[PDB]
Structure formats: C-alpha cells, structure tokens
C-alpha cells in the first residue's frame, strides 16, 4: 500500500464500521436440489 507520502493505499478511504453479522450464516440452496422433500416436509429440523 505504500506510495511514498500521500498516505498508504487503503487509509485514504473512511471505514464502513458496520456489518450484517448474518451474511455468513444466511445460506443459499438451489432450486434444482432437495427434490425428494426430505421424506415428507422440508423444515429446519429435516435440514439439520
């Protein structure tokens, strides 16, 4: 990041300082999967 003066690369931009805290536990499942309905009904229990 060092450019010679001018403040290094990243420190020019202010922080965002705030995150979702759920963006790494939200989960995605594709519509082409789970076609047998986990033996009856797809629930957090049968996914678990």
């Amino acid at each position: 990041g060092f450019e010679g003066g001018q403040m290094p690369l990243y420190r020019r931009l202010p922080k965002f300082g705030f995150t979702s805290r759920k963006a790494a536990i939200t989960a995605e499942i594709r519509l082409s999967d789970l076609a047998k309905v986990e033996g009856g009904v797809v629930d957090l229990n049968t996914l678990k």
Binding site: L9, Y10, L13, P14, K15, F16, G17
Partner: protein
C-alpha cells in the same frame, strides 16, 4: 506460511459481483461548516476503486 488479510483495509472496502471493490468516498467527515454545498454534493456520491489501484487492493484482500 499462508498470506494475511490487511484488516485496516477490510474495514474500508466491499467486493462486487464482477470482482471490483466499493468504498463510501472520503473528505465528507470534517469541516462541513466550510465545505461548499456543491462540494459536499460532489463528495456524497458512492464509488468504486479504480483500475490503477485495484490491483493493490486485491493484494491486500487476498481471500475476499
């Protein structure tokens, strides 16, 4: 050993679908009682990291 992420950079940039990085722009955090209306409106638009410096940001955020 494995290379590290620059934590002071990860607090400042967010990745895009096309592999670029977003930032909220600078110069909007001080002396707004002297900075002109038109100047504040030119700093308020949100932006991304440009091609001349982007190659260094991906080298600071290697696992992003």
């Amino acid at each position: 050993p494995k290379i590290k992420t620059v934590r002071g950079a990860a607090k400042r940039f967010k990745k895009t679908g096309k592999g670029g990085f977003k930032h909220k722009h600078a110069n909007l955090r001080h002396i707004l009682t002297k900075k002109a209306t038109k100047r504040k409106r030119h700093l308020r638009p949100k932006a991304m990291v440009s091609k001349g410096d982007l190659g260094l940001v991906i080298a600071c955020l290697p696992y992003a």
